[PDB]
Amino acid sequence: MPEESSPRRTPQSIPYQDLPHLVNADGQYLFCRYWAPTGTPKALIFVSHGAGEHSGRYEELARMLMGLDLLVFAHDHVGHGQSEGERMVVSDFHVFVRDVLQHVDSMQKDYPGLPVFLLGHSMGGAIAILTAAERPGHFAGMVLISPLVLANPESATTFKVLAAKVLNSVLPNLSSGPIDSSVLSRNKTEVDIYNSDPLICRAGLKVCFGIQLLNAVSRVERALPKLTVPFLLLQGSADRLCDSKGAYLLMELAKSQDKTLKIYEGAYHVLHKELPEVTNSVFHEINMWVSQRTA
Ligand SMILES: O=C1COc2ccc(C(=O)N3CCC(Cc4ccccc4)CC3)cc2N1
Ligand code: NA
């Protein structure tokens, strides 16, 4: 008699049978999160995390959104957090967009006729833009927190040289240095929390993944004149990771009839985990923006 193989486990050795999950088109398990209100939801909202991090970092934002009677859902992107895949590796950047679309499609089957929003930070913002651009008119709105539109110029110039060298030869281990965690937020407690989280990949950026982030930037640029989805864009003026010039480019080139930019003067990258004055404003602005578009 044949036997069923050992249960599939997360990279942290937890069986997927014990966790909310989804199997993607490549047969990879993605770890899922849900925050549903007690009553009938007004809308659905997918939360799209950034490079190296995971969906668990959106607990507070998701509970605020759930408090607005929205059903919030997320997953860890392939190669991240509790999902399968070699850490910080992706065959093509579109895998992330395809998987967001599978999860949105699955949720819309369980909750038909509901409007669907996207919330994305940084790489997760680039994924949200490409997701909305793939399906014009399907999403009700997008909330972008320091989305990856234009990388820091000095950082991108150094990386593009490193990328062309990997593209010309066989160097599977080549990586750039790790992200300077101090540039993430002026809130030192949040920098320390980021450095303490075992689900975060704090290793150097592998050149192959960096090339996919370069592809994301190129694709976002091409997608902008196709964008018609309503959006709220939040950007720090002192962001060393996603250049503020990218947020002005998105406001200028998107075709969306409903677009709003809020600049946080002197703020760093992770606006939803910045100094309390910034973070409280970020939560309040998202709250007002989504409440106005779900009323
Ligand atoms: O809360 C956190 C935790 O720490 C992070 C770390 C990374 C990012 C991120 O997604 N990118 C996009 C990619 C950026 C570099 C890049 C490389 C190559 C091309 C374009 C940009 C860096 C910033 C986001 C956060 N946010
Ligand atoms: Na379903």
Swiss-Prot record:
It is a peripheral membrane protein. Pathway: Glycerolipid metabolism; triacylglycerol degradation. Detected in adipose tissue, lung, liver, kidney, brain and heart. Keywords: Cytoplasm, Fatty acid biosynthesis, Fatty acid metabolism, Hydrolase, Lipid biosynthesis, Lipid degradation, Lipid metabolism, Membrane, Nitration, Phosphoprotein, Serine esterase. The modification 3'-nitrotyrosine is found at residue 58. It is found in: Cytoplasm, Cytosol; Membrane. The keyword Metal-binding does not apply. One of its GO terms (cellular component) is endoplasmic reticulum membrane. Changing residue 194 to F: Does not affect ability to hydrolyze 1- or 2-monoacylglycerol. One of its GO terms (biological process) is regulation of signal transduction. It catalyses: Hydrolyzes glycerol monoesters of long-chain fatty acids; a 1-acylglycerol + H2O = glycerol + a fatty acid + H(+); a 2-acylglycerol + H2O = glycerol + a fatty acid + H(+); 1-octanoylglycerol + H2O = octanoate + glycerol + H(+). GO terms for molecular function: lysophospholipase activity; monoacylglycerol lipase activity; protein homodimerization activity. Its EC number is 3.1.1.23. InterPro entries: AB_hydrolase_1, AB_hydrolase_fold, Hydrolase_4, MAG_DAG_Lipase. The active site is at residues 122, 239, 269. It is an enzyme of class 3 (hydrolase). The modification Phosphothreonine is found at residue 10. Short-term inhibition causes analgesia, while long-term inhibition causes tolerance to endocannabinoids acting on brain cannabinoid receptor CNR1, and a reduction in brain cannabinoid receptor CNR1 activity. Converts monoacylglycerides to free fatty acids and glycerol. Hydrolyzes the endocannabinoid 2-arachidonoylglycerol, and thereby contributes to the regulation of endocannabinoid signaling, nociperception and perception of pain. Regulates the levels of fatty acids that serve as signaling molecules and promote cancer cell migration, invasion and tumor growth. PANTHER family: PHOSPHOLIPASE-RELATED. Homodimer. Belongs to the AB hydrolase superfamily. Monoacylglycerol lipase family. This is Monoglyceride lipase. The lineage of its organism: Eukaryota, Metazoa, Chordata, Craniata, Vertebrata. The gene is MGLL.
